[PDB]
Structures are given as C-alpha cells and as structure tokens.
Amino acid sequence: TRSSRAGLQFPVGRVHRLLRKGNYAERVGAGAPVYLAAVLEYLTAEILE
C-alpha cells in the first residue's frame, strides 16, 4: 500500500490529492504522485543529517 508498493518513506497517497486539488493541469499524470513523494523524501534526508 503506497509506501509499500512504491517502497518509500514519504506519503504517496497524500501529494496526489493536493496536486489534483491545487488544480495544476486538466487531469493528472500517473507518473507524478509517486515520483513527487520520492524526491521530497530524498531532500528531507539530505538536511537532517
């Protein structure tokens, strides 16, 4: 389930919703919620340490 299937530490089923409610393009590409959680986690980790 999202983190699982994706294999990330970030919420994949949270940024998908905001990107569709922000109202960016007409519909949303399937690519992004998942990809978009990934880089975010990556940045998150780069600072903490």
Please list, in sequence order, all residues whose beta carbon lies within 8 angstroms of the beta carbon of residue 10, skipping any fewer than 6 positions away. Answer: 3, 37, 38, 40, 41, 44
Least Å from the CB of residue 1 to DNA: 5
**Smallest distance from the beta carbon of 48 to DNA, in angstroms?**
11
In this complex, which beta carbon is closest to DNA, that of residue 4 or of residue 46? Answer: 4
For residue 32, the tally of other CB atoms under 10 A from its CB is: 15
Q: Which residues bind DNA (CB under 7 A)?
A: 1-2, 12-14, 16-17, 25-27
Q: What is the CA radius of gyration of the chain?
A: 12
- Our CB check for DNA shows the closer of 2 and 41 to be 2
